[PDB]
């Protein structure tokens, strides 16, 4: 009934609209996840680093129940909450083995959406 994975990878996805944190095992199966919206942060608040911190904390606490003691941080997107989220993971007590940035960069691939004229 209870998972027992000591080592996992935490994926933090930071966007200007929202920040999402998911803790997964090394295999990549999700153990727990939390978001600013899930914690009830709305609108501008979701972007704020505090919201990201809280999201990281909530996800980490669940991960500790799964028995995760060491976690690897994977960062995606340019959202401001990324910095707080990484600190919050360690503040929760999950060991951060490593930090990596996985934000996707196309080698001149598909066309982007139009620029907003306002």
């Amino acid at each position: 009934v209870k998972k027992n994975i000591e080592n996992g990878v935490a994926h933090i996805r930071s966007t200007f609209n929202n920040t999402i944190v998911t803790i997964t095992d090394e295999f990549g199966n999700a153990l727990s996840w939390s978001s600013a919206g899930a914690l009830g942060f709305k609108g501008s608040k979701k972007s704020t680093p505090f919201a990201a911190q809280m999201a990281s904390e909530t996800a980490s606490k669940s991960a500790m129940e799964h028995g995760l003691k060491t976690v690897e941080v994977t960062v995606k997107g340019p959202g401001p909450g990324r910095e707080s989220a990484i600190r919050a993971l360690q503040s929760a007590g999950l060991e951060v083995t490593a930090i990596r940035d996985v934000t996707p960069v196309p080698h001149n691939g598909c066309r982007p959406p139009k620029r907003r004229r306002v």
């Binding site: 942060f41 501008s44 704020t48 505090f50």
Partner: protein, 146 residues
């Protein structure tokens, strides 16, 4: 559009209690420059609170103000929770005390004030509630603290 800060005025210690805060509280109670009425109200209120409390009037006053004064407040810039200035904190405490005393339904102002300070020491005072309300909104805007 302002050159800079202006030096603040100072108050003489209240003769009865040798406390600056007592002098400041008198001034807030005073209306139309009628000092005598304000002093009369505060001293009478202090005697009443002391009698009912069974503790030193200055002691309960200290406890009351401590409960009323707020650590954090929100100022629009969005509302951002900011540390209240120590001098500002005293101002807010005394201001709320007198204002809430006026809101109270006791016939005489001295009775109102004495009840408020006693209730403020109890932490059941309406001025203390104002502090609580100020703290609630500060916690709500914690994300906007930055």
């Amino acid at each position: 559009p302002r050159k800079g800060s202006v030096p603040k005025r100072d108050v003489l210690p209240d003769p009865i209690h040798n406390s600056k805060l007592v002098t400041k509280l008198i001034n807030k109670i005073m209306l139309d420059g009628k000092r005598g009425t304000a002093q009369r109200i505060l001293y009478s209120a202090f005697d009443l609170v002391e009698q009912r409390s069974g503790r030193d009037a200055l002691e309960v006053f200290e406890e009351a103000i401590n409960n009323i004064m707020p650590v954090l407040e929100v100022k629009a810039r969005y509302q951002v929770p900011v540390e209240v200035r120590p001098e500002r904190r005293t101002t807010l405490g005394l201001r709320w005390l007198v204002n809430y005393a006026r809101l109270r339904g006791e016939k005489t102002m001295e009775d109102r004030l004495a009840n408020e300070i006693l209730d403020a020491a109890n932490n059941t005072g309406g001025a203390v509630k104002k502090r609580e309300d100020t703290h609630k909104m500060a916690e709500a805007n914690k994300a906007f603290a930055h």
